[PDB]
Design a protein around this ligand. Structure first.
Ligand SMILES: [Mn+2]
Ligand SMILES: [Mn+2]
Ligand SMILES: [Mn+2]
Ligand SMILES: [Mn+2]
Lengths: 358, 358
């Protein structure tokens, strides 16, 4: 099974990293144990969607390409390692974003920095280590691979894009013209920057590059198949599926009970430029906009309840269904275009869409 | 002048980074301005010792190697860019370490995260961007260079080592056997881990790799001269000079007035494994150790004053002078050994020592 190989490689990668800390970085056993627990707590327990996308893309090409058995095994091992690079990159983001946002829970468990023996003082550095481990992995496992340079270059550009996206995200409730390191940032009062275009830019950089583009292209690279596809189509379809992913996340933040969500959603309190706020402001009458402005972005539970009420009364299910229908058209169109050069890869993308959509 | 070229390249690198944000990352002008101010505030204003070491090593080899003039200029430009990679890496560390430690000032100015329009929520991500910029620089300026892979590999291993060193540093006041993410960490009461060996491990990883080893080897790489030297000697001498650097920093933290230091030193309050504490515990009688334990690691100003008194009464100037004399012997010995294969590089190391020592 794909999952079974993927999880076995985690054990191998963990052992390599911790053994190297002992043999080359002079680490002692208690700190090795701390880092092992940190790695498990921050990297394990999700769905491994991103990492497994690398594996699944690679498996698709193995099914139609002649290889020695040892080569099949090496490609699958490379896909697993590259998948864990992305999972560790996500772990880095989640650790640091939870600190930056003051989040409380993540996947039914306390955020890493809130563990009693961690604290922010250690957790910021723990998140730095998680990202450094992605590079240690690559240089060790891919040292002699022909895709090493392309993979490292891709990884770093996606990582940079994601940090730029985090800036877009955490500043999305400020007026751009008032941004200034010397002046404490007030929340917007006109919400003029709550537009579809601006929302799409947040999501594209914050989410879609590392969640959809990177796993797909990494699967191509470890398969030596990047010339088998039109890269502009891979970008466009990743952008599309990633945006749909984030729209779903945004809806759930407001409307999924905390036990199922795994956290208490705070997008309203945090004044996020979410799909609900943008779409509501694309629909609302004057009265409703005024009420939204009077209540959005405040921890006060009665104000949050007014915003959720406005959202419920706004029939945003209709907008979501129409958004979803348009995304189905465009994603299907792009999958069709991908078949011109690689039916195999087009099928992998169809699977990524089906897992995202349904 | 070397400094004049180095600072000119900053302007060039800044322009490249910000222009690329506009042309490829969809940035708007106010956020470009924020990032420009962030870059200037976090990267400028120090001595540029690390960055200029790259330049000076490269200049040493230019003086004795035949090159076309355009090649001399390209090598110096590469040395400047590689120097700014290290300066931006340091900027990353300082931003994140100041947040992790709750520091107040850095170089006579508030720490970046304490700017009113920054906040920890933005500053953690700003520090992430600073490090991502080091990689954007390398891939853009060194794309076709033969040293690209060696440089990237070196940079990432030094970066990893530094994060491991930060872990050693911020955990240095806890008993290793009690380290545990599930349990809030108490300060040591026996100080058994305040030893020269353990202190040297903190310093080696936290400081010496990125402050001394990386600039020296980067200067070799951009000069295509790494085979001109014995790398084990470069490591040993970097370790030695870097440790002396940190010992000086530790003394100043306790004894240099804040205006000259640029901050209010808090190593005693923070219970740091500093050279003063280790050396004091290497000298003290039972009575003095007991008093140290009763007062170390507490913000209470009268307790800090008791520790400073113990340090003053302990005649640690004698230990420092004897430490310094031994470092002079060993550094001179290693410079002599370096002359066997490269007098030019040995001279660059002598300059790095002279700037550190005097
Ligand atoms: Mn966030
Ligand atoms: Mn969300
Ligand atoms: Mn620190
Ligand atoms: Mn210090």
């Amino acid at each position: 099974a794909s999952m079974e190989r993927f999880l076995s490689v985690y054990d191998e990668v963990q052992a390599f990293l911790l053994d190297q800390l002992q043999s080359k970085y002079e680490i002692d056993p208690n700190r090795a144990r701390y880092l092992r627990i940190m790695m498990d707590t921050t990297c394990l327990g999700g769905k491994y969607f991103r990492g497994m996308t690398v594996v699944n893309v690679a498996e698709g090409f193995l099914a139609v390409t002649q290889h020695d058995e040892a080569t099949k095994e090496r490609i699958l091992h490379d896909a697993c390692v590259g998948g864990w690079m992305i999972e560790f990159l996500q772990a880095h983001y989640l650790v640091e974003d939870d600190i930056m946002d003051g989040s409380v829970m993540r996947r039914g468990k306390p955020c890493w920095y809130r563990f009693p023996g961690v604290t922010t003082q250690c957790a910021i550095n723990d998140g730095i280590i998680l990202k450094s481990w992605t590079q240690i992995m690559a240089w060790h496992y891919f040292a002699d691979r022909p895709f090493l340079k392309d993979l490292l270059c891709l990884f770093q550009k996606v990582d940079y894009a994601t940090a730029v996206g985090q800036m877009y995200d955490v500043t999305s409730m400020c007026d751009s013209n008032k941004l200034d390191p010397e002046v404490a940032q007030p929340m917007t009062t006109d919400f003029a920057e709550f537009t579809p275009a601006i929302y799409k830019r947040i999501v594209k950089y914050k989410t879609t590059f590392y969640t959809y583009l990177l796993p797909l292209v990494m699967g191509l690279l470890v398969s030596e198949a990047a010339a088998s596809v039109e890269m502009n189509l891979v970008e466009r379809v990743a952008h599309l599926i990633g945006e749909y992913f984030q729209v779903q996340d945004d809806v759930m933040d407001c409307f999924t009970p905390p036990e199922q969500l795994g956290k208490v959603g705070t997008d309203i309190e945090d004044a996020k430029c979410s799909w609900l706020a943008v779409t509501f402001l694309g629909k609302a009458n004057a009265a409703q906009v005024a009420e939204f402005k009077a209540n959005y972005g405040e921890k006060d539970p009665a104000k949050v309840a007014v915003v959720k009420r406005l959202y419920s009364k706004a029939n945003l299910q209709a907008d979501f269904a129409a958004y979803e229908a348009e995304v189905v058209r465009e994603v299907e169109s792009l999958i069709e275009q991908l078949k011109v050069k690689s039916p195999t890869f087009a099928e992998s993308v169809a699977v990524v869409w089906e897992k995202t959509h349904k």
